[PDB]
Design a protein around this ligand. Sequence first.
Ligand SMILES: [Mg+2]
Ligand SMILES: [Mg+2]
Ligand SMILES: [Mg+2]
Ligand SMILES: [Mg+2]
Ligand SMILES: [Mg+2]
Ligand SMILES: [Mg+2]
Ligand SMILES: [Mg+2]
Ligand SMILES: [Mg+2]
Ligand SMILES: [Mg+2]
Ligand SMILES: [Mg+2]
Ligand SMILES: [Mg+2]
Length: 182
Amino acid sequence: KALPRLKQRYREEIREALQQEFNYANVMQIPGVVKVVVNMGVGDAARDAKLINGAINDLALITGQKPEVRRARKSIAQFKLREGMPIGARVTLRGDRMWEFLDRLISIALPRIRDFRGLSPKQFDGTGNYTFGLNEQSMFHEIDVDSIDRPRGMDITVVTTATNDAEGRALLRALGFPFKEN
RNA sequence: GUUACGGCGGUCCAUAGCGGCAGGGAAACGCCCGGUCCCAUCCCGAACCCGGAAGCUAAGCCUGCCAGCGCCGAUGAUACUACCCAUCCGGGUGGAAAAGUAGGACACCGCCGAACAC
Ligand SMILES: [Mg+2]
Ligand SMILES: [Mg+2]
Ligand SMILES: [Mg+2]
Ligand SMILES: [Mg+2]
Ligand SMILES: [Mg+2]
Ligand SMILES: [Mg+2]
Ligand SMILES: [Mg+2]
Ligand SMILES: [Mg+2]
Ligand SMILES: [Mg+2]
Ligand SMILES: [Mg+2]
Ligand SMILES: [Mg+2]
């Protein structure tokens, strides 16, 4: 008896706009958002693993669901890194959690970005895939500024079912993230 | 019996694989919707699983065509070798490669089950 507003927008106007504007053979060739992954790797756990717990707490307040601790598959003596330490965090947003998190991002963080000039179009890899990395991590309203001790990382990732770059452009612009103009 | 239909299997498992080009939703096969209850995430209904058919053959799958790449492969020749003669030098009988070549080539078959007909 509940349905997110962005999902509603997608199922009412976005899909029909895409369908009419590229003239697909069928209807479900509409691209769709697939998965939302949120994570970051501190890298200094090789010296101190205490801040991993702080990163876990930060992720917990950001997504609301418990993160992960994963190791390194290779050993780098130059980085004083061997297999077995936990290196970063991991969590994934899926379904209603995708839609709520995308809402929260687009409506709270992007307007607030310090010195926001938009995002370029040229960071796709030819099939509409996009993961990337941000100036400051305390940006969401769900986290408080008084309790932070050091700048760490955090994640906002959107991906598509898109076959190539054309519908990637189309659907990302229909959804409306601050794309630059060149 | 027919079908552009799904399962279980075969063969000294690529003549059967990869890629490109077209077509399919009657039932089925898929994608799909949402997590009250079984069940689970080293997080997440992603996977498994729970409940249904609003929607769709585009992927998957199948069928058909392409020699683009892979694959199989002669007859004949060459290398090798078992045995024996010939004062070193060499020859006679038997077996016959590998590579390459003309070409072949976009699998075949068995048992049940789905729609139509008898
Ligand atoms: Mg893609
Ligand atoms: Mg039907
Ligand atoms: Mg689901
Ligand atoms: Mg198709
Ligand atoms: Mg397909
Ligand atoms: Mg070969
Ligand atoms: Mg072949
Ligand atoms: Mg011969
Ligand atoms: Mg003798
Ligand atoms: Mg002699
Ligand atoms: Mg031969």
